[PDB]
Amino acid sequence: VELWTRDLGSCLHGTLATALIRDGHDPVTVLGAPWEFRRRPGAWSSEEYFFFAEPDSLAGRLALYHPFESTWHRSDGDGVDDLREALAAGVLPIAAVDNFHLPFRPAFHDVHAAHLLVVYRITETEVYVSDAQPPAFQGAIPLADFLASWGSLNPPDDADVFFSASPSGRRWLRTRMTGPVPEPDRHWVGRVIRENVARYRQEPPADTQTGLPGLRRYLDELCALTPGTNAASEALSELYVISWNIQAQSGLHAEFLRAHSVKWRIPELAEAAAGVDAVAHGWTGVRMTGAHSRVWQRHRPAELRGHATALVRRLEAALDLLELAADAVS
Amino acid sequence: VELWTRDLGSCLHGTLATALIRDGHDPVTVLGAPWEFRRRPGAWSSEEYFFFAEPDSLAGRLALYHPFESTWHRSDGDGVDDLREALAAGVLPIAAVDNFHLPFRPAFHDVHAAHLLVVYRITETEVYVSDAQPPAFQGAIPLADFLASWGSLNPPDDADVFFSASPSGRRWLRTRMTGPVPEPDRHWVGRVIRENVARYRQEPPADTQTGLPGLRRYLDELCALTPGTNAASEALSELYVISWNIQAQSGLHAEFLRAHSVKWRIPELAEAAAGVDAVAHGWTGVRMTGAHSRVWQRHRPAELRGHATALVRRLEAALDLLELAADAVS
Amino acid sequence: LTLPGTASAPEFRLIDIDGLLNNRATTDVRDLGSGRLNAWGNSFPAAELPAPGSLITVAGIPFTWANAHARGDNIRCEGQVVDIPPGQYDWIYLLAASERRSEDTIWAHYDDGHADPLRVGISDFLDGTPAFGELSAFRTSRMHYPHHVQEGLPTTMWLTRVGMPRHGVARSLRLPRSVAMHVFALTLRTAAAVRLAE
Amino acid sequence: LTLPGTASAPEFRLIDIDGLLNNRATTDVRDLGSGRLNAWGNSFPAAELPAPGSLITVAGIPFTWANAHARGDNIRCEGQVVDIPPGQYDWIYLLAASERRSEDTIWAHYDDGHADPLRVGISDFLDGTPAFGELSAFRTSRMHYPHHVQEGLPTTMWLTRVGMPRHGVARSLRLPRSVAMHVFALTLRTAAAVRLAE
Ligand SMILES: N[C@@H](CC[C@H](O)[C@@H](N)COS(=O)(=O)O)C(=O)O
Ligand SMILES: N[C@@H](CC[C@H](O)[C@@H](N)COS(=O)(=O)O)C(=O)O
Ligand SMILES: [Mg+2]
Ligand SMILES: [Mg+2]
Ligand SMILES: [Mg+2]
C-alpha cells in the first residue's frame, strides 16, 4: 500500500492512486490522461473529494480512458464488519472520514473537514489507514477513533466553510479495474490529447458548464455576484471546493505530458505540459482570490476578474499547444 | 521641414507628421492618441498610404481626437502651377508619387509603388521634396522627374503586387488644424484610452469590420480562403496593404503611452504600451506570413491561423492593460 | 565549439521592503492566531527563520530579513510598484512562497518608458515541490496553525530568479497582482560584462 | 544596502546551425537575385558581414559565423528544434533580425520533461530601432536589392539575450514559429556560481 499525492492534489487522486498502485497500474497514466472542466449548478458537496462524475462513476470519470469503476456504499450498524469482508475479498476500501476525529491530522479536535483515506488492514482493536495528504501517515489507529471519524456528523464549522456540514455517513468507495488497460503508446497519447481538446472546444449543454465555453460562462456568472453577499459566499465556497480536483487534474495532466515527453524525447509534449501547468497555476489565482474574499472578507472583484480572464487565455493557449503535441505523436 | 517616421510606419504617418511639426504640433500626440481596427470590403486601394477614413477625412481619422482635416485635390494640366499657389498660401502639399520615377528612391526605374512625399519649395527648374522613408531624402529634384512621378500611370507591376496599379493622378493632400489642439492632460489621456477601448469592444453593425470583433471576423474570413486561389491572392494583397498603417498606428499609440508614462511617472501607461506594442508585433507575424504566401507561394495556412489567433489574444490583453492605465490617469 | 568566458564582479542591491509589508506569513507560539500565510491562518514558525533586520545568504545570494511589525512580515502581492536604484541588471532574486504553486508577471520599468513583463513562478509553502527549478531557501520542520504548532509538516520558502534581458536602466518593478504570492526578500544583481577569455 | 559579488568564469557553447540554414538573407554583388531576407528580395551585403566560418565576438559574446551554402546562410524561424549540449545555462544569445520588429517564444526543453517558454524580441533588419533593448551586432552602410546595391541604407542585425531561469539540465531549444524572424548565430552561456566578495 503506497502513499501517493501531489502538492496540487487532494485525498481524491491520492486514495485512487494507492488503489491503482496496489493493482500494478501507473496513477500518472490513469488519472493524468483525462483533462476536462465541468460544473453542474447544485451538484457540489462540501467535501475535499467532490468531483462532477455523472453519468460516469467517480473513479470512472477521473480515469475516463481506463476501464476503472467505483461504487459508493453506506455501511449499516456500528462496527467495521463490511470493511473486514471487503479486505478479505481483496478490495482496498476508501473511507469517507472527518479530519476532526483523525489523531494524525492537523485538524484533530480543531477543524471539521470531509476527507478520504485508504483502509488496508483491520484487527479486533485497530484500523490500519494510509493517508498521503501532508503530513502523510500510514499505520494503526484505535478502532474507536476510526469509527468516530467514519460516523462523524461533520457539523457546520466556522473554521471550515468549504469541507464541513457533510456527514461521513459511514460511506466508503470501492474501486475495480474491470478489464485490461490500453497500451499507452504514441497513438494512444495522441487520441487522449485529441479527445480532451475536442471535449474542451465543444459548446456545452444549457444545464452543465463544460470545457472552454463552460469555463467562460462559469467565471462570468461568478464575477457578476456582489462581493460579501450570501449569493457570493455560496458561489465562492463552491468555487474553492470544485476547483481543487479540477486544478489537481490539470497538474496531473501536465505531469502525464512531461512523462511521455521524456519517454519518447518529443518536445511538443513538454511544451503542451507547460501550457497545461499554466492552467493549473491559473486556478491558484482564481480560487485563492475567492478563498480570501470568502473567509477574510478580502473583496477584490477586479483581481478575481483578472485571474478569471488569465485562466481562460491560458486554457485557449494550452489547447493550441496540445493540438501540436497530438500531431507530433499521431 | 522636419523628416519624421518610425520603422513600423509608412509615408502616410511620415508626411502628416512633417505637416504637423511645421504647425508646431507633436505628431506622437496627434497621430499616436488614436488606436483602432477597421476594414471595409472593397474600400482598399493598392497604395502604401491606404487607410479606411470614412466618414472622416484621411488626416481626420488618423488624428481622431484633434481638429485636423485633409482634402484630396487632382491638378489639371502638365505643370506644378497649383502646387506653387499652395506653397504661397503656407500649405505643405503632400503629393501622390510613384517611387519608380523618384531618382532618390531605391525603386527608381525598378519597382512601381504608390507613395507620398512633402513638397516644400518649387523653382523654375526644380521641385524640393522631403521623404523620411528609408533611405530619407530632402532637397531639389529636376521638375521633369517630379512631374513623371506625380503624373505616373503606376501600372500593374509583378515586382509589386501591393502598391502598383494606382495612378498618382497628380493627386495631392492639403492638411490643416482648424482650431487649437486639446490640452493633453491626465484626464484627456484617460478619455482617449477609454474611447479607444470602447470602440475596440463595440460590435460592428454591418459589412464594415471594426474593433476586436471585426478583427476576429476579418482574420477568420482570411484563413477560410484556399491558398493559391485568385480570391486568396486578392485577400493577401489587401491584408498586407491595409495592415501597414493599422500596424503603424499600433506602434505610434504604444509610443504615445510610453511618452506620457515618462512625463507623469505612471507605470500603468508603460505596461499598457507594452501590451499595445505586442499587438504591433503580432501584426508582423500575420502580414509577413501573408506576404510570403502571396509573393513566393509559401502556403502555410497553419502558420497564418496561428499568427491570427495570437494577434487577437494580444489585442484582448492590451485592452485590459489600457483600462488599468485609464484608471491610473483618471 | 566550447570557449571559456571571464570571471565577473556583479553587485547585489538588497531592496528595503519594510514599507511594503502588508501581511503576516510568520508567527511565534504566542501569536499563532495572527497567521495569514493562507486562508486557513497557517504561518511559518518564526523560531526556524532568520532574525528581522539580519543579513543572510541563500545559495550564495545575500538578502536582508524584513524588519517585521505586528501587521506585516512579508509582501502579499497586490501589484505593488517597488522603486529600485537606477542601473543595468541581470537578475531579480526573490525569497517567496505561494498558496499552491502559481506563475505571474514582474514588470520591469525602464527610464525610456519601456516596461518588460517578466515571467515568475513561485512554488507551494505547504511542503512544496519546486515546479520552476527554484532553489530551497527554507524548509522548516514544523508549521503554525491558528491554535497549535504542527510537528512533522515542513513549511517551504523558495529562492526564485527572474532574468532582466533588456540593455537599459531599470528604475522600478511591479510585483504580481496575486494574493496567493508572498515575497519575504528582494535582491537585485547588477549587469557585469562577461566575454570570451583572452 | 549594497554588497560586492563574485561570479566564476562561465563557458560559451557556440551552436553549429549549418545544418538548419534554410534561407538566404545575405548576397554578394554577383548574386543579388538570391536575396530572401524579406518578401521584396532584399539582403545584407556579404561584404559588410564576417567571413563564413570565422570566430567573432559581439559585445564580448563569442559566435561562429555560419558556413553558408547557395540555399542557406541563416535560420528563417519555423519552430526548429536545436539540440544543445546538456547542461545548466543562464543565457541564450542570438544574432537575429526580423521583417519588421516582432516578438515570439524560444522554448527551453529540460531533462525532467519541463519546457519553459522564453520571450524573445527581434528588431527590424530595415534600418531598425532596437525595441527590446538589444545591442547592435551589425549596422551596414548599404542594402542589397534584386537588381542593385543601395547606397546609404543600413541593414541592421541585433544581439538579443534570453534568460534561462530554471535550475535544471537543458537538452534542446525550439526557435520561434515566425517567417519574419532570422537567426544568424546561436551561443549558450553556462551557469556560474555567484557569491559575496571575500
Ligand atoms: N491544504 C488544503 C486542505 C486543507 C484541509 O481541509 C484542512 N483545512 C483541514 O484538514 S487537515 O487535517 O488537512 O488540516 C487546502 O489548502 O484547502
Ligand atoms: N518597406 C515597406 C515598403 C516597400 C516599398 O514599397 C518598396 N518595395 C518600393 O519603394 S522603395 O522606393 O521604398 O523601394 C515594405 O516592406 O512593405
Ligand atoms: Mg469509464
Ligand atoms: Mg510518430
Ligand atoms: Mg476629426
Q: Please tell me the experimental approach by which this structure was elucidated.
A: X-ray
Q: Mark whether A162 and A15 lie in a shared domain.
A: yes
CA distances for A12 relative to A166, A241, A248, B147, D117, angstroms: 16, 12, 9, 81, 31
Type of residue found at A67: P
A223 Cβ inside 6 Å of ligand 1: no
Distance CA C120, CA C133 (A): 11
Distance CA D146, CA B296 (A): 14
| Final residue of a structural domain among B177, B202, B219 | B177
How far is the centre of ligand 3, averaged over its atoms, from the C-alpha of A55 (Å)?
10
Q: Whose CA is nearest to atom 16 of ligand 2?
A: D40
Residues sharing a CB contact under 8 Å with residue A211, sequence separation 6 or more, in sequence order? A36, A37, A199, A200, A201, A202, A204
A100 Cβ inside 6 Å of ligand 1: no
Q: Does the N-terminal peptide bond of residue A55 adopt cis geometry, omega within 30 degrees of 0?
A: yes
Pairing between β-strand A94-98 and β-strand A114-122 as defined by DSSP bridges: antiparallel
Q: Whose CA is nearest to atom 2 of ligand 1?
A: A10
Q: Does B323 touch chain C (CB under 8 A)?
A: no
Task: Identify whether B219 is part of a domain.
Answer: yes
Q: Mark whether B137 and B194 lie in a shared domain.
A: no
Q: Mark whether B203 and B318 lie in a shared domain.
A: yes
Q: Mark whether B168 and B196 lie in a shared domain.
A: no
* Biggest alpha carbon–alpha carbon distance for chain A: 57
| Chain B residues near residue A317 by CB distance under 8 angstroms | 313
Angle between the N-to-C axes of helices A230-264 and A186-201, in degrees from 0 to 180, rounded to the nearest 10: 160
Secondary structure in 3-state letters for chain A: CCCCCCCCCCHHHHHHHHHHHHCCCCHHHHHHCCCCCEECCCCCCCCCCCCCCCCCCHHHHHCCCCCEEEEEEECCCCCCHHHHHHHHCCCCCEEEEEHHHCCCCCCCCCCCCEEEEEEEEECCCEEEEEECCCCCEEEEEEHHHHHHHHCCCCCCECCECCCCCCCCCCEEEEEEECCCCCCCCHHHHHHHHHHHHHHHHCCCCCCCEEHHHHHHHHHHHHHHCCCCCHHHHHHHHHHHHHHHHHHHHHHHHHHHHHHHHHHHCCHHHHHHHHHHHHHHHHHHHHHHHHHHHHHHCCCCHHHHHHHHHHHHHHHHHHHHHHHHHHHHHC
Helix (H, G, I), strand (E, B) or coil at D114: coil
In chain D, which residue ranges form alpha helices assigned H by DSSP?
A: none
The dihedral formed by the CA atoms of A289, A292, A294 and A299, expressed in degrees to the nearest 10: -70
CA C136 to the chain's CA centroid: 12
Measured in angstroms, the CA of A191 and the nearest CA of chain D are apart by 20
Type of residue found at A254: A
Distance CA B102, CA A6 (A): 69
Contact criterion met (CB < 8 Å) for D113 and A271: no
Distance CA A117, CA A138 (A): 10
In the beta sheet, which residues pair with residue D74?
A: D23
Distance CA C61, CA C59 (A): 6
Whose cell is 501531489? That residue is A6
Q: Does the N-terminal peptide bond of residue A34 adopt cis geometry, omega within 30 degrees of 0?
A: no
Q: What is the resolution of this structure in A?
A: 1.8
Q: Mark whether B155 and B301 lie in a shared domain.
A: no
Distance CA B317, CA B309 (A): 13
Helix (H, G, I), strand (E, B) or coil at D40: coil
CA distances for A91 relative to A1, A24, A175, angstroms: 12, 14, 8
- Give the dihedral sign, CA A259/A265/A267/A268: negative
B103 Cβ inside 6 Å of ligand 2: no
Task: Identify whether A1 is part of a domain.
Answer: no
In the beta sheet, which residues pair with residue A98?
A: A114
Distance CA A192, CA A194 (A): 6
Helix (H, G, I), strand (E, B) or coil at D8: coil
User: Is the distance from CB of A94 to CB of A173 less than 8 angstroms?
Assistant: yes
Secondary structure in 3-state letters for chain B: CCCCCCCCCCHHHHHHHHHHHHCCCCHHHHHHCCCCCEECCCCCCCCCCCCCCCCCCHHHHHCCCCCEEEEEEECCCCCCHHHHHHHHCCCCCEEEEEHHHCCCCCCCCCCCCEEEEEEEEECCCEEEEEECCCCCEEEEEEHHHHHHHHCCCCCCECCECCCCCCCCCCEEEEEEECCCCCCCCHHHHHHHHHHHHHHHHCCCCCCCEEHHHHHHHHHHHHHHCCCCCHHHHHHHHHHHHHHHHHHHHHHHHHHHHHHHHHHHCCHHHHHHHHHHHHHHHHHHHHHHHHHHHHHHCCCCHHHHHHHHHHHHHHHHHHHHHHHHHHHHHC
Give the three cell numbers for residue A242: 470544485
Q: Does A289 touch chain C (CB under 8 A)?
A: yes
Q: Does A313 touch chain D (CB under 8 A)?
A: no
Looking at all shown ligands, the one closest to residue A117's CA atom is 1
Query: Would you say how long chain B is, in residues?
Result: 330
Which one of A28, A252, A262 would you mutate to disrupt binding with D, by most D Cβ within 10 Å of its Cβ? A262
Q: Does A180 touch chain C (CB under 8 A)?
A: no
Nearest to B164 by CA among B50, B309, B329: B50
Distance CA C2, CA C4 (A): 7
Chain B neighbors (3+ CB pairs < 8 Å): A, C, D
Nearest to A19 by CA among A62, A81, A56, A65: A62
Contact criterion met (CB < 8 Å) for B277 and D131: yes
Nearest to C162 by CA among C123, C122, C129, C198: C122
CA distances for A258 relative to C130, D115, D164, angstroms: 15, 9, 19
Task: Identify whether B53 is part of a domain.
Answer: yes
| Final residue of a structural domain among A111, A143, A177 | A177
Distance CA D44, CA D24 (A): 9
Give the three cell numbers for residue B163: 502598391
- Give the dihedral sign, CA A309/A312/A318/A323: negative
Task: Identify whether A2 is part of a domain.
Answer: no
Phi, psi at residue A192, to the nearest 5°?
-55, -50
User: Is the distance from CB of A304 to CB of A223 less than 8 angstroms?
Assistant: yes
Distance CA A36, CA A38 (A): 7
Distance CA A243, CA A316 (A): 18
User: Is the distance from CB of D4 to CB of C11 less than 8 angstroms?
Assistant: yes
Give the three cell numbers for residue B81: 502651377
Give the three cell numbers for residue A15: 486514495
Helix (H, G, I), strand (E, B) or coil at D105: strand
Helix (H, G, I), strand (E, B) or coil at D95: strand
Type of residue found at D168: G
Q: Mark whether A190 and A42 lie in a shared domain.
A: no
Q: Mark whether A197 and A318 lie in a shared domain.
A: yes
Distance CA B99, CA B79 (A): 19
Query: Which ligand 1 atom is nearest residue A108's CA?
Result: 12
Region of C133 please: left (phi>0), alpha (psi -120 to 50) or beta: left
Pairing between β-strand C44-45 and β-strand C26-27 as defined by DSSP bridges: parallel
Q: Mark whether B201 and B171 lie in a shared domain.
A: no
Residues sharing a CB contact under 8 Å with residue C172, sequence separation 6 or more, in sequence order? B267, C81, C82, C83, C84, C109
Secondary structure in 3-state letters for chain C: CEEEECCECCEEEECCCHHHCCECCEECHHHHHHCCCCCCCCEEEHHHCCCCCCEEEECCEEEECCCCECCECEEECCCCEEEEEEECEEEEEEEEEECCCEEEEEEEEECCCCEEEEEEEECECECCCCCCCCEEEEECCCEECCCCEECCCCEEEEEEEEECCCCCCEEEEECCCCCCEEEEEEEEEECCCCCECC
Chain D neighbors (3+ CB pairs < 8 Å): A, B, C
User: Is the distance from CB of A70 to CB of A174 less than 8 angstroms?
Assistant: yes
Domain with residue B107: its CATH number is 3.90.70.10
Task: Identify whether B5 is part of a domain.
Answer: no
User: Is the distance from CB of A273 to CB of C131 less than 8 angstroms?
Assistant: no
Q: Does the N-terminal peptide bond of residue C50 adopt cis geometry, omega within 30 degrees of 0?
A: no
Q: Does the N-terminal peptide bond of residue B135 adopt cis geometry, omega within 30 degrees of 0?
A: yes
Nearest to D17 by CA among D52, D58, D66: D66
Distance CA D82, CA D90 (A): 17
Residues sharing a CB contact under 8 Å with residue A33, sequence separation 6 or more, in sequence order? A63, A64, A65, A66, A184, A192, A253, A256
Distance CA B5, CA B258 (A): 17
Measured in angstroms, the CA of D167 and the nearest CA of chain A are apart by 16
Helix (H, G, I), strand (E, B) or coil at D99: coil
Nearest to D25 by CA among D96, D79, D101: D96
Pairing between β-strand C75-76 and β-strand C81-87 as defined by DSSP bridges: unpaired
Whose cell is 507560539? That residue is C29
Type of residue found at A259: A
User: Is the distance from CB of A234 to CB of A41 less than 8 angstroms?
Assistant: no
Distance CA A37, CA B309 (A): 22
Give the three cell numbers for residue B116: 507620398
- Residue A191: give the domain boundaries: 186-329
Angle between the N-to-C axes of helices A186-201 and A211-224, in degrees from 0 to 180, rounded to the nearest 10: 40
Nearest to A141 by CA among A158, A121, A159: A121
Give the three cell numbers for residue D42: 532584399
Task: Identify whether A3 is part of a domain.
Answer: no
How far is the centre of ligand 5, averaged over its atoms, from the C-alpha of B129 (Å)?
27
In the beta sheet, which residues pair with residue C162?
A: C92
| Residue B330: other Cβ atoms inside 10 A | 12
Q: Mark whether B222 and B296 lie in a shared domain.
A: yes
Distance CA D47, CA D63 (A): 18
Nearest to A175 by CA among A86, A105, A247: A86
Q: Half-sphere exposure of D92 toward its Cβ, with a 13 Å CA cutoff?
A: 32
CA distances for A124 relative to A88, A95, A140, D7, angstroms: 14, 18, 12, 65
Rg (CA), chain A: 20
Whose cell is 564582479? That residue is C9
| Final residue of a structural domain among A177, A205, A231 | A177
Which DSSP helix (H) or strand (E) runs through D143?
A: strand D143-144
Measured in angstroms, the CA of B312 and the nearest CA of chain A are apart by 11
| Residue C51: other Cβ atoms inside 10 A | 9
Q: Does B306 touch chain D (CB under 8 A)?
A: yes
The dihedral formed by the CA atoms of B141, B144, B145 and B148, expressed in degrees to the nearest 10: 150
- Give the dihedral sign, CA C66/C69/C70/C72: negative
Query: Which ligand 2 atom is nearest residue B111's CA?
Result: 9
Q: What angle do CA D44, D48, D50 make, to 5 degrees?
A: 100
Rg (CA), chain C: 18
Helix (H, G, I), strand (E, B) or coil at D12: strand
Phi, psi at residue A105, to the nearest 5°?
-90, 140
Nearest to B98 by CA among B5, B4, B163, B158: B163
Task: Identify whether A246 is part of a domain.
Answer: yes
Q: What angle do CA B22, B25, B28 make, to 5 degrees?
A: 115
Q: Mark whether A306 and A283 lie in a shared domain.
A: yes
Which burial class, exposed, middle or buried, applies to B24 when counting CB atoms under 10 A from its CB (0-12, 13-18, 19+)? exposed
Whose cell is 494577434? That residue is B311
Pairing between β-strand C102-110 and β-strand D26-27 as defined by DSSP bridges: unpaired
How far is the centre of ligand 2, averaged over its atoms, from the C-alpha of B215 (Å)?
25
Helix (H, G, I), strand (E, B) or coil at D47: helix
Distance CA D122, CA D161 (A): 10
Minimal-distance CA residue of chain A relative to B305: A320
Distance CA C194, CA C4 (A): 10
When divided into structural domains, chain A yields a total of 2
Task: Identify whether A6 is part of a domain.
Answer: no
Q: Mark whether A22 and A88 lie in a shared domain.
A: yes
Phi, psi at residue A115, to the nearest 5°?
-140, 165
Minimal-distance CA residue of chain D relative to A321: D117
Nearest CB among C11, C162, C167 relative to D133 is that of C167
Nearest to C184 by CA among C71, C70, C85, C67: C67
Distance CA C133, CA B109 (A): 59
Interior/surface letters A231-270, b for 16+ CB within 10 angstroms, e for the rest:
ebbebbbbbbbbbbbbbbbbbbbbbbbbbbbbeeebbbbb
| Chain A residues near residue B268 by CB distance under 8 angstroms | none
Minimal-distance CA residue of chain D relative to A266: D113
User: Is the distance from CB of D181 to CB of D160 less than 8 angstroms?
Assistant: no
Q: Mark whether B168 and B199 lie in a shared domain.
A: no
How far is the centre of ligand 1, averaged over its atoms, from the C-alpha of A152 (Å)?
17
Sequence-separated contacts (24+) of B68-71 with Cβ below 8 Å? B68/B20, B68/B30, B68/B175, B68/B176, B68/B177, B68/B178, B69/B175, B69/B176, B69/B178, B70/B173, B70/B174, B70/B175, B71/B173, B71/B174
CA B211 to the chain's CA centroid: 17
| Residue B6: other Cβ atoms inside 10 A | 20
User: Is the distance from CB of C193 to CB of C121 less than 8 angstroms?
Assistant: no
Rg (CA), chain B: 20
User: Is the distance from CB of D12 to CB of C5 less than 8 angstroms?
Assistant: yes
Which one of C129, C178, C181, C182 would you mutate to disrupt binding with A, by most A Cβ within 10 Å of its Cβ? C178
Residues sharing a CB contact under 8 Å with residue A262, sequence separation 6 or more, in sequence order? D111, D112, D113
User: Is the distance from CB of A86 to CB of A71 less than 8 angstroms?
Assistant: no
In the beta sheet, which residues pair with residue C26?
A: C44
Query: Structural domains in chain C?
Result: 21-190 (2.60.120)
Residues sharing a CB contact under 8 Å with residue A180, sequence separation 6 or more, in sequence order? A67
Distance CA D41, CA D23 (A): 11
Distance CA B169, CA C132 (A): 62
Whose cell is 477597421? That residue is B38
Nearest to B253 by CA among B285, B276, B278, B284: B276
